[PDB]
Amino acid sequence: SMSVKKPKRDDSKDLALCSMILTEMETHEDAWPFLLPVNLKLVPGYKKVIKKPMDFSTIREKLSSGQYPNLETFALDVRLVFDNCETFNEDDSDIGRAGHNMRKYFEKKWTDTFK
DSSP states (O other), rough: TTOOOOOOOOTTTTTHHHHHHHHOOOOOOTTTSSOOOOOOOTTTTTHHSSOOOHHHHHHHHHHHHOOOOOHHHHOOOOOOHHHHHHHSSSSSSHHHHHHHHHHHHHHHHHHHOOO
């Protein structure tokens, strides 16, 4: 509350560390469904159904330009990518499996780097 704060966690390395995680997600062999925005002209139903599209290149641009206020808003966009994927793709599909795999890969790096 006013003049009452928990001890100050060092957040000075968070930007650099989120960048490293994102590099690792970018270079994963199963990243290909997520590297670029879904083409809303060429994929019927995507625009109407997925209210907040997100992809790794859009996260990269947001990260590089100071549009994440803190590490939690970064994680929320990464998770959005996988939530979108599950909304539109059957579990038993190459893309559906890719999304589950990448979400696992992310959540471990996230825990190991920050928890």
